[PDB]
Amino acid sequence: SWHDLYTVLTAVIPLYVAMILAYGSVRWWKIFSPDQCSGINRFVAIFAVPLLSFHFISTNNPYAMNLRFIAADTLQKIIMLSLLVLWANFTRSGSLEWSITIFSLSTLPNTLVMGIPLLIAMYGEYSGSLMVQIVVLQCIIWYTLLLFLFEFRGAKMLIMEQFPETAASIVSFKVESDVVSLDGHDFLETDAEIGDDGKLHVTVRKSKNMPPASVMTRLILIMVWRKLIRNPNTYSSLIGLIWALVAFRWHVAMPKIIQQSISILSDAGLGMAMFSLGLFMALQPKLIACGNSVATFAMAVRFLTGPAVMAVAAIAIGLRGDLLRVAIVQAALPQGIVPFVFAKEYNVHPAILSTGVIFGMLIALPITLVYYILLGL
Amino acid sequence: SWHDLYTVLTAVIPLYVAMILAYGSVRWWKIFSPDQCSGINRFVAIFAVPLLSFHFISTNNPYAMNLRFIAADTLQKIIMLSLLVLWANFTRSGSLEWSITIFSLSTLPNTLVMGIPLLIAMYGEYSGSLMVQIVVLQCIIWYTLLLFLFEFRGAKMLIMEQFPETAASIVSFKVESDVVSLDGHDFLETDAEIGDDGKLHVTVRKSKNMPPASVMTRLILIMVWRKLIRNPNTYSSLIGLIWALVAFRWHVAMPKIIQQSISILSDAGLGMAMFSLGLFMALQPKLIACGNSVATFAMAVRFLTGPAVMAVAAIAIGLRGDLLRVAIVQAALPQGIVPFVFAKEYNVHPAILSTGVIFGMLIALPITLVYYILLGL
Ligand SMILES: O=C(O)Cc1c[nH]c2ccccc12
Ligand SMILES: O=C(O)Cc1c[nH]c2ccccc12
């Protein structure tokens, strides 16, 4: 069915035209400076992607969500998390940063930018709705889980660097509001005060024992809240969900003035997202930025373990027909950007995630097609 | 008819939402650095505006152009040019830079970004087609005339600075291809060689008498060609005109793959144009950048002499009914950006054009409405 191939090409190749246009602008024609490219990327991440996410989340009703598809996706991610946990806590080389990066590679594809257009072209509008469900679920649950993991990593590094000898005695953390996140870019000073009852209180501000679960839970919860209240995508997804709920429970259409005020900048979503992705491709001196062997490992994870674990989860749940094919092909999408972002700010295998994103993007068509043809047999 | 007012507000206010969003991003929230803002602006000028112009020019057939409307616009501009010529050549204070800036203020509104949406909202789709006709005519003829004038200014300044005593003897100019334009940013060295027949030849490369009309014509023509072959809007308008001619003579629709490859970046046209305009508003330390008195003069010219000269030209030509109203209201639009751009690279009253553009943009609604209501009586 070469007509279906041409339809998929028509739907997907505009994104690559934009991406290659940006890549040539930075490499061939040198139209943009690195800081100008960074400015375009910042505009994208702050306005174009959050507004595109708001658009997609608001235009689908949460009450018609396919619960079985959601269960299949969450089961894939739960299987990945369980395997990673038992690998990290029962292995000599088991590690937390590797757990996070493997979770991102094997479970978090690019569902917003390329996923929705591609899957709509490949299967239909219902597939677009399913992809948007995956997008909302991912931005609300799994990116927040990534935030929890990254903040735990930062807190653990700070604890091991500040008070390793007697970290167990700490009972409460008080972080001044100036400390936005525990990324590690800024140095965080710590002071310890002994209480009347012999207890220890730690205060952290801007310049081998585990404390109780409650103390770390409090610290991570407050820090995660402080980073969520400053994440454009968090507000986008929340406000979109609330608006969708109210507008599909009471059938209330948004006023045309507000709808167009949002669309004027959301219409620049796909194009600017792909343009900034091309700018990033060009800026990076490498294309396989994490080494050939480990890059091959990351590609293999993304395009086999993602689809394979999604398949086992889907047949376990009971998905069949075009729904199972949509699930698997979605799992075979190129690795998402937001996990790469978090990896970059937290400097946790950022090269692996960059290679994932860009390389998979420009080899996502052959693999995704092969998947579609193979599943069609 | 407050419903018509609300429709105009719905059509126009999204642009101001984007513009104020950029203004706040640079001033209130300080999301963008000045160089990042410059990068966004450069992306706009190179991709979003040329692609938007290509879209608009290609989607209307040149064979259905309203010749009387075109004649009215060209008559307005011819009247302005004749008055400016007789003022500059028959007055003590008559000047060339003032001629160019007054022509830009009184004749070159923002017809692409705000003009088409506004006039479509106010009158209808045919008004959008008329505005696109004005856009194509302006980018092909009047911006090229601006280029001719600016290149003549630069050439005259170089002549007066290099060889004032015996400029009359020069017979031929030879500019090395490295010299892209005579803007004045780079210093241009000149060498004079006496020929066998007693003639003088000048060569200009990168570091009170008038020569014959032929020599200056040759120099200006070659320099204008060299700047046109590097203007994104020139290629946009040309290729759009050729495609429109071929696609409306043979009814040949563009392939969907190419159409979407172009649309993915042209869809970011209005939003990114207004976003960059807001970025420019914020970056400029002033809002009335050219002084209160001269800024008032520029606003008066823009919103009275433009509309008034357009009106006299339109009744002279024979426009009547909604066509005359569309002509006048279009003449009352805020001052265009491309003339401001040329003024900036040629450093010819750039503050006047900045004030024109931005100030008129955020006072274009009251004036344009007043015009619409007054013409409706
Ligand atoms: O991160 C991605 O690339 C895909 C994605 C899924 N949900 C999102 C929400 C906001 C921005 C991007 C995404
Ligand atoms: O310059 C303006 O702001 C309006 C306009 C008319 N014709 C144009 C062609 C390309 C870019 C802008 C314009």
PDB file of C-alpha atoms in Angstrom, chain A residues 93-275:
ATOM      1  CA  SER A  93      26.638  -2.102  38.696  1.00  0.00           C
ATOM      2  CA  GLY A  94      23.024  -1.239  39.506  1.00  0.00           C
ATOM      3  CA  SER A  95      22.728   2.534  39.583  1.00  0.00           C
ATOM      4  CA  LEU A  96      20.127   5.277  39.922  1.00  0.00           C
ATOM      5  CA  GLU A  97      21.197   7.546  37.063  1.00  0.00           C
ATOM      6  CA  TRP A  98      21.246   4.536  34.743  1.00  0.00           C
ATOM      7  CA  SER A  99      17.787   3.629  36.033  1.00  0.00           C
ATOM      8  CA  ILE A 100      16.452   7.092  35.181  1.00  0.00           C
ATOM      9  CA  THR A 101      18.064   7.253  31.744  1.00  0.00           C
ATOM     10  CA  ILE A 102      16.927   3.730  30.838  1.00  0.00           C
ATOM     11  CA  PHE A 103      13.390   4.581  31.949  1.00  0.00           C
ATOM     12  CA  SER A 104      13.448   7.669  29.729  1.00  0.00           C
ATOM     13  CA  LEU A 105      14.854   5.780  26.736  1.00  0.00           C
ATOM     14  CA  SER A 106      12.556   2.761  27.041  1.00  0.00           C
ATOM     15  CA  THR A 107       9.286   4.464  28.032  1.00  0.00           C
ATOM     16  CA  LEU A 108       9.158   8.196  27.143  1.00  0.00           C
ATOM     17  CA  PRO A 109       8.875   8.707  23.365  1.00  0.00           C
ATOM     18  CA  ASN A 110       8.166  11.968  21.573  1.00  0.00           C
ATOM     19  CA  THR A 111       4.383  11.771  21.652  1.00  0.00           C
ATOM     20  CA  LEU A 112       3.493  15.462  21.270  1.00  0.00           C
ATOM     21  CA  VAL A 113       5.462  16.825  18.316  1.00  0.00           C
ATOM     22  CA  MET A 114       5.933  13.817  16.026  1.00  0.00           C
ATOM     23  CA  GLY A 115       3.740  11.224  17.719  1.00  0.00           C
ATOM     24  CA  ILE A 116       0.315  12.777  17.177  1.00  0.00           C
ATOM     25  CA  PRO A 117       0.820  13.738  13.491  1.00  0.00           C
ATOM     26  CA  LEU A 118       2.530  10.464  12.625  1.00  0.00           C
ATOM     27  CA  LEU A 119       0.000   8.205  14.339  1.00  0.00           C
ATOM     28  CA  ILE A 120      -2.920  10.216  12.947  1.00  0.00           C
ATOM     29  CA  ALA A 121      -1.528   9.704   9.450  1.00  0.00           C
ATOM     30  CA  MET A 122      -0.807   6.018  10.037  1.00  0.00           C
ATOM     31  CA  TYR A 123      -4.101   4.950  11.643  1.00  0.00           C
ATOM     32  CA  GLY A 124      -6.556   7.838  12.038  1.00  0.00           C
ATOM     33  CA  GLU A 125      -7.994  10.574  14.241  1.00  0.00           C
ATOM     34  CA  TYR A 126      -8.760   8.204  17.117  1.00  0.00           C
ATOM     35  CA  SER A 127      -5.040   7.430  17.181  1.00  0.00           C
ATOM     36  CA  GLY A 128      -4.407  11.149  17.559  1.00  0.00           C
ATOM     37  CA  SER A 129      -6.761  11.213  20.532  1.00  0.00           C
ATOM     38  CA  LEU A 130      -4.965   8.217  22.055  1.00  0.00           C
ATOM     39  CA  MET A 131      -1.610   9.925  21.510  1.00  0.00           C
ATOM     40  CA  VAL A 132      -2.894  13.059  23.244  1.00  0.00           C
ATOM     41  CA  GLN A 133      -4.058  10.886  26.147  1.00  0.00           C
ATOM     42  CA  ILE A 134      -0.531   9.479  26.367  1.00  0.00           C
ATOM     43  CA  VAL A 135       0.825  13.038  26.223  1.00  0.00           C
ATOM     44  CA  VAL A 136      -1.319  14.301  29.098  1.00  0.00           C
ATOM     45  CA  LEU A 137      -0.675  11.187  31.185  1.00  0.00           C
ATOM     46  CA  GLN A 138       3.066  11.489  30.585  1.00  0.00           C
ATOM     47  CA  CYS A 139       3.330  15.203  31.425  1.00  0.00           C
ATOM     48  CA  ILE A 140       1.160  14.839  34.522  1.00  0.00           C
ATOM     49  CA  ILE A 141       2.480  11.564  36.022  1.00  0.00           C
ATOM     50  CA  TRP A 142       5.731  10.347  34.492  1.00  0.00           C
ATOM     51  CA  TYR A 143       7.513  13.679  34.080  1.00  0.00           C
ATOM     52  CA  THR A 144       6.585  14.398  37.697  1.00  0.00           C
ATOM     53  CA  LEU A 145       8.045  10.996  38.594  1.00  0.00           C
ATOM     54  CA  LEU A 146      11.201  12.016  36.736  1.00  0.00           C
ATOM     55  CA  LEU A 147      11.199  15.209  38.806  1.00  0.00           C
ATOM     56  CA  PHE A 148      10.901  13.154  41.992  1.00  0.00           C
ATOM     57  CA  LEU A 149      13.811  10.933  40.950  1.00  0.00           C
ATOM     58  CA  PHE A 150      16.043  13.842  39.905  1.00  0.00           C
ATOM     59  CA  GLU A 151      15.321  15.796  43.088  1.00  0.00           C
ATOM     60  CA  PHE A 152      16.068  12.684  45.139  1.00  0.00           C
ATOM     61  CA  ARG A 153      19.374  12.328  43.292  1.00  0.00           C
ATOM     62  CA  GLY A 154      20.267  15.955  43.975  1.00  0.00           C
ATOM     63  CA  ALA A 155      19.281  15.729  47.634  1.00  0.00           C
ATOM     64  CA  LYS A 156      21.278  12.521  48.071  1.00  0.00           C
ATOM     65  CA  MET A 157      24.355  14.090  46.477  1.00  0.00           C
ATOM     66  CA  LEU A 158      24.039  17.118  48.762  1.00  0.00           C
ATOM     67  CA  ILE A 159      23.639  14.885  51.824  1.00  0.00           C
ATOM     68  CA  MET A 160      26.674  12.794  50.886  1.00  0.00           C
ATOM     69  CA  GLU A 161      28.714  15.951  50.252  1.00  0.00           C
ATOM     70  CA  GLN A 162      27.631  17.957  53.332  1.00  0.00           C
ATOM     71  CA  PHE A 163      26.940  15.684  56.334  1.00  0.00           C
ATOM     72  CA  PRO A 164      27.932  12.103  55.474  1.00  0.00           C
ATOM     73  CA  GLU A 165      29.008  11.088  58.972  1.00  0.00           C
ATOM     74  CA  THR A 166      25.688  11.756  60.766  1.00  0.00           C
ATOM     75  CA  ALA A 167      23.032  12.260  58.101  1.00  0.00           C
ATOM     76  CA  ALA A 168      20.753   9.893  60.032  1.00  0.00           C
ATOM     77  CA  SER A 169      20.124  12.414  62.828  1.00  0.00           C
ATOM     78  CA  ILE A 170      18.507  14.988  60.517  1.00  0.00           C
ATOM     79  CA  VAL A 171      14.775  15.365  61.160  1.00  0.00           C
ATOM     80  CA  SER A 172      13.658  18.400  59.109  1.00  0.00           C
ATOM     81  CA  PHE A 173      14.903  20.463  56.172  1.00  0.00           C
ATOM     82  CA  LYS A 174      14.127  24.163  55.709  1.00  0.00           C
ATOM     83  CA  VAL A 175      15.027  25.409  52.225  1.00  0.00           C
ATOM     84  CA  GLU A 176      14.843  29.142  51.606  1.00  0.00           C
ATOM     85  CA  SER A 177      12.595  30.093  48.706  1.00  0.00           C
ATOM     86  CA  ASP A 178      15.588  31.444  46.767  1.00  0.00           C
ATOM     87  CA  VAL A 179      16.694  27.841  46.134  1.00  0.00           C
ATOM     88  CA  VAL A 180      14.556  27.029  43.090  1.00  0.00           C
ATOM     89  CA  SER A 181      15.879  23.503  42.487  1.00  0.00           C
ATOM     90  CA  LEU A 182      18.623  21.054  43.460  1.00  0.00           C
ATOM     91  CA  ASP A 183      19.960  20.800  39.903  1.00  0.00           C
ATOM     92  CA  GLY A 184      23.512  21.553  41.059  1.00  0.00           C
ATOM     93  CA  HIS A 185      24.288  24.651  38.986  1.00  0.00           C
ATOM     94  CA  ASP A 186      24.489  26.786  42.143  1.00  0.00           C
ATOM     95  CA  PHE A 187      26.326  25.870  45.331  1.00  0.00           C
ATOM     96  CA  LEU A 188      24.047  25.182  48.309  1.00  0.00           C
ATOM     97  CA  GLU A 189      25.407  25.906  51.778  1.00  0.00           C
ATOM     98  CA  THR A 190      24.101  23.931  54.753  1.00  0.00           C
ATOM     99  CA  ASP A 191      23.914  24.682  58.479  1.00  0.00           C
ATOM    100  CA  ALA A 192      23.158  22.182  61.253  1.00  0.00           C
ATOM    101  CA  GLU A 193      21.649  23.167  64.610  1.00  0.00           C
ATOM    102  CA  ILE A 194      21.165  20.824  67.564  1.00  0.00           C
ATOM    103  CA  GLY A 195      17.741  21.101  69.168  1.00  0.00           C
ATOM    104  CA  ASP A 196      16.785  20.983  72.823  1.00  0.00           C
ATOM    105  CA  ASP A 197      15.850  17.281  72.667  1.00  0.00           C
ATOM    106  CA  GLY A 198      19.183  16.343  71.075  1.00  0.00           C
ATOM    107  CA  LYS A 199      17.682  16.483  67.578  1.00  0.00           C
ATOM    108  CA  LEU A 200      19.412  17.982  64.532  1.00  0.00           C
ATOM    109  CA  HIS A 201      17.821  20.453  62.103  1.00  0.00           C
ATOM    110  CA  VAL A 202      19.424  21.361  58.773  1.00  0.00           C
ATOM    111  CA  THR A 203      18.934  24.553  56.771  1.00  0.00           C
ATOM    112  CA  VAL A 204      20.113  24.801  53.156  1.00  0.00           C
ATOM    113  CA  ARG A 205      20.474  28.126  51.340  1.00  0.00           C
ATOM    114  CA  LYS A 206      22.158  29.553  48.251  1.00  0.00           C
ATOM    115  CA  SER A 207      25.827  30.525  48.422  1.00  0.00           C
ATOM    116  CA  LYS A 208      26.734   6.368  54.508  1.00  0.00           C
ATOM    117  CA  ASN A 209      23.358   6.390  56.263  1.00  0.00           C
ATOM    118  CA  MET A 210      19.879   7.373  55.120  1.00  0.00           C
ATOM    119  CA  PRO A 211      17.759   9.706  57.281  1.00  0.00           C
ATOM    120  CA  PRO A 212      14.135   8.736  57.955  1.00  0.00           C
ATOM    121  CA  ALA A 213      11.817   8.339  54.994  1.00  0.00           C
ATOM    122  CA  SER A 214       9.633  11.183  56.279  1.00  0.00           C
ATOM    123  CA  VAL A 215      12.441  13.761  56.218  1.00  0.00           C
ATOM    124  CA  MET A 216      13.516  12.979  52.660  1.00  0.00           C
ATOM    125  CA  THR A 217       9.870  12.781  51.592  1.00  0.00           C
ATOM    126  CA  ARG A 218       9.250  16.276  52.969  1.00  0.00           C
ATOM    127  CA  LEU A 219      12.350  17.719  51.307  1.00  0.00           C
ATOM    128  CA  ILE A 220      11.607  16.126  47.940  1.00  0.00           C
ATOM    129  CA  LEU A 221       7.921  17.076  48.062  1.00  0.00           C
ATOM    130  CA  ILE A 222       8.622  20.740  48.776  1.00  0.00           C
ATOM    131  CA  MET A 223      11.369  20.922  46.150  1.00  0.00           C
ATOM    132  CA  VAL A 224       9.196  19.174  43.550  1.00  0.00           C
ATOM    133  CA  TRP A 225       6.394  21.637  44.281  1.00  0.00           C
ATOM    134  CA  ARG A 226       8.800  24.544  43.865  1.00  0.00           C
ATOM    135  CA  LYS A 227       9.956  23.249  40.488  1.00  0.00           C
ATOM    136  CA  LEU A 228       6.424  22.382  39.323  1.00  0.00           C
ATOM    137  CA  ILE A 229       5.082  25.877  40.064  1.00  0.00           C
ATOM    138  CA  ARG A 230       7.735  27.176  37.632  1.00  0.00           C
ATOM    139  CA  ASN A 231       7.356  24.600  34.833  1.00  0.00           C
ATOM    140  CA  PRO A 232       5.455  25.983  31.807  1.00  0.00           C
ATOM    141  CA  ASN A 233       4.392  22.482  30.764  1.00  0.00           C
ATOM    142  CA  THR A 234       2.947  21.799  34.224  1.00  0.00           C
ATOM    143  CA  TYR A 235       0.635  24.811  34.028  1.00  0.00           C
ATOM    144  CA  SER A 236      -0.158  24.001  30.403  1.00  0.00           C
ATOM    145  CA  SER A 237      -1.220  20.434  31.210  1.00  0.00           C
ATOM    146  CA  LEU A 238      -3.113  21.326  34.388  1.00  0.00           C
ATOM    147  CA  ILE A 239      -5.039  24.293  32.976  1.00  0.00           C
ATOM    148  CA  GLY A 240      -5.739  22.218  29.875  1.00  0.00           C
ATOM    149  CA  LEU A 241      -7.154  19.365  31.944  1.00  0.00           C
ATOM    150  CA  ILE A 242      -9.354  21.678  34.024  1.00  0.00           C
ATOM    151  CA  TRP A 243     -10.594  23.463  30.906  1.00  0.00           C
ATOM    152  CA  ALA A 244     -11.295  20.165  29.148  1.00  0.00           C
ATOM    153  CA  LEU A 245     -13.218  18.874  32.160  1.00  0.00           C
ATOM    154  CA  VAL A 246     -15.347  22.015  32.459  1.00  0.00           C
ATOM    155  CA  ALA A 247     -15.862  22.394  28.691  1.00  0.00           C
ATOM    156  CA  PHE A 248     -16.848  18.745  28.155  1.00  0.00           C
ATOM    157  CA  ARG A 249     -19.008  18.430  31.277  1.00  0.00           C
ATOM    158  CA  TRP A 250     -20.978  21.622  30.545  1.00  0.00           C
ATOM    159  CA  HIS A 251     -20.239  21.728  26.785  1.00  0.00           C
ATOM    160  CA  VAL A 252     -18.799  25.240  27.161  1.00  0.00           C
ATOM    161  CA  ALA A 253     -16.809  26.426  24.155  1.00  0.00           C
ATOM    162  CA  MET A 254     -14.005  28.878  24.824  1.00  0.00           C
ATOM    163  CA  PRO A 255     -14.717  32.428  23.593  1.00  0.00           C
ATOM    164  CA  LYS A 256     -13.426  32.979  20.077  1.00  0.00           C
ATOM    165  CA  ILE A 257     -11.264  35.923  21.160  1.00  0.00           C
ATOM    166  CA  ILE A 258      -9.418  33.790  23.722  1.00  0.00           C
ATOM    167  CA  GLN A 259      -9.334  30.785  21.390  1.00  0.00           C
ATOM    168  CA  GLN A 260      -7.635  32.831  18.665  1.00  0.00           C
ATOM    169  CA  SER A 261      -5.351  34.622  21.134  1.00  0.00           C
ATOM    170  CA  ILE A 262      -4.077  31.174  22.115  1.00  0.00           C
ATOM    171  CA  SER A 263      -4.055  29.711  18.594  1.00  0.00           C
ATOM    172  CA  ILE A 264      -1.961  32.557  17.173  1.00  0.00           C
ATOM    173  CA  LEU A 265       0.968  31.213  19.214  1.00  0.00           C
ATOM    174  CA  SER A 266      -0.048  27.543  19.363  1.00  0.00           C
ATOM    175  CA  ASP A 267      -0.143  27.473  15.556  1.00  0.00           C
ATOM    176  CA  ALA A 268       3.622  28.069  15.745  1.00  0.00           C
ATOM    177  CA  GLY A 269       3.929  24.858  17.771  1.00  0.00           C
ATOM    178  CA  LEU A 270       4.906  22.102  15.346  1.00  0.00           C
ATOM    179  CA  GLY A 271       7.011  24.322  13.109  1.00  0.00           C
ATOM    180  CA  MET A 272       8.940  26.028  15.887  1.00  0.00           C
ATOM    181  CA  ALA A 273       9.405  22.761  17.784  1.00  0.00           C
ATOM    182  CA  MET A 274      10.978  21.120  14.742  1.00  0.00           C
ATOM    183  CA  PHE A 275      12.967  24.267  13.931  1.00  0.00           C
TER     184      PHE A 275
END
